[PDB]
């Protein structure tokens, strides 16, 4: 229930060390399905998910040519932004772009995106509803004017509310055995006598998909956040994700604490408690 | 599937 398709582009200048490096990756939900690296020896858009391999040679030739056209453009933008900001020829700079679309539980369109960044800062983006632009400064305003004279905004919507959505669905159905799956988290709790009066409880969640999950603690039924530590969701390396919440409790009172795990694969939320 | 046309900034 609820899906999305996203493309992420990153171009980095290397004055003196040859032409600029270009990397592109494509995701459906939390699964990466495509790759392209300007420095790799293949010079092909490559598959990173199994379901995408059922597409014929037409798709692969078209996506490769489209991603090579994309690199050349970003390569020109690097020289163009350097000029707008009156920057040195020898410094390394970064250009990034993200575009994609969201769909609800019923696969109907919800939101679209097209954002651009220079040196990790917002440069110019299409607004939330897709009908206008947001420029960060005077250089972005210069870009904004070329784009509106070239009627860019109208091209993107057509793609975000149509093509992006049409393919997202095509990918979800053809790869339904691994994209529409829901792997509930394998959970357990560990204990560590930290010292003379302290004790640490660690609540786990391993092998889950999609990455969306909430891990919270409660002391006597009340959200206990004091002396707790929650880590960022991290990838296992096999398509699944991991995460843990830990709390430091007074020695002898650990059964008053409980861990609550919420995830899409769990019909009912799990409540873990320390049982030796 | 990628967007085909991209305008320079």
């Amino acid at each position: 229930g609820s899906h999305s398709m996203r493309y992420f582009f990153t171009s980095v200048s290397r004055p003196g060390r040859g032409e600029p490096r270009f990397i592109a990756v494509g995701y459906v939900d939390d699964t990466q399905f495509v790759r392209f690296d300007s420095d790799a020896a293949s010079q092909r858009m490559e598959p990173r998910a199994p379901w995408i391999e059922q597409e014929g040679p037409e798709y692969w030739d078209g996506e490769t040519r489209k991603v090579k056209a994309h690199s050349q453009t970003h390569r020109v933008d690097l020289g163009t932004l350097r000029g707008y900001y009156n920057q040195s020829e020898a410094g390394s700079h970064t250009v990034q772009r993200m575009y994609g679309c969201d769909v609800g539980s019923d696969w109907r369109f919800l939101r679209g995106y097209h954002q651009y960044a220079y040196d990790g800062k917002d440069y110019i983006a299409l607004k939330e509803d897709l009908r206008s632009w947001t420029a960060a400064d005077m250089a972005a305003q210069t870009t904004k004017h070329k784009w509106e004279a070239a009627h860019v905004a109208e091209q993107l919507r057509a793609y975000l509310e149509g093509t992006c959505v049409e393919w997202l669905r095509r990918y979800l159905e053809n790869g339904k055995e691994t994209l529409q799956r829901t792997d509930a988290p394998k959970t357990h709790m560990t204990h560590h006598a930290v010292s003379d009066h302290e004790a640490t409880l660690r609540c786990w969640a391993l092998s889950f998909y999609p990455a969306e999950i909430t891990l919270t603690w409660q002391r006597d039924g009340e959200d206990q956040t004091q002396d707790t530590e929650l880590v960022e969701t991290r990838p296992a390396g096999d398509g699944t994700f991991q995460k843990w919440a830990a709390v430091v409790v007074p020695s002898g009172q650990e059964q008053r604490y409980t861990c609550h795990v919420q995830h899409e694969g769990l019909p009912k939320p799990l409540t873990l408690r320390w049982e030796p | 599937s990628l967007l085909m046309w991209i305008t320079q900034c």
Partner: T-cell receptor
Amino acid sequence: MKQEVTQIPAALSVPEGENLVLNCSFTDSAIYNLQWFRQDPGKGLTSLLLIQSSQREQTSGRLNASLDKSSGSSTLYIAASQPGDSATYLCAVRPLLDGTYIPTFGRGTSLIVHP
Amino acid sequence: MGVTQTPKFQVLKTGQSMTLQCAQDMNHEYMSWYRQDPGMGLRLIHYSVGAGTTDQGEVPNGYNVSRSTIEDFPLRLLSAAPSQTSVYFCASSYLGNTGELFFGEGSRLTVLE
């Protein structure tokens, strides 16, 4: 399918001062743009008008074109024709989705405006 | 801002290899070559979407192209043949913006026995 541009009539002879209408149609509506050119014997091609898939009409002096993308057809209008307008008129389109970027030209319309 | 082709005219003997140049200073990602016989349509030879890549058009045989930089897109006849007598047009464009195609003046080649 595959894109196919067609221009009828193939040839066209008229007296000066008349208002001309040239046709250009295409079988695949998924286009990024449409462009009209002019070409005289033993010379290069001069671009006349460019109409993008968003916009539906462009003007340049006595010339004006209109794009009806959805119907797969464009019409070039030439006001008060002159002998200087005698030439071959070509129309072309660029693809929006195929990922090849290859344009598709029509056979062209041969025009001769007599004084 | 323009497309420049050289040479404008050229005579070759059968078997000669010749290179036709084509440059542009507008940062167009797309560059291409056509050949057109007297009173006939334009036919694509080869093309390119950026420095480092190229593609075959309708008639790639007997021709070779390179695209090491964004500014240039040369065309090479490996071994000139009488059948190659034609008018060669180079054409560039952005792969964005209006996508308008810009044609060079044309190069007139006649291959003789």
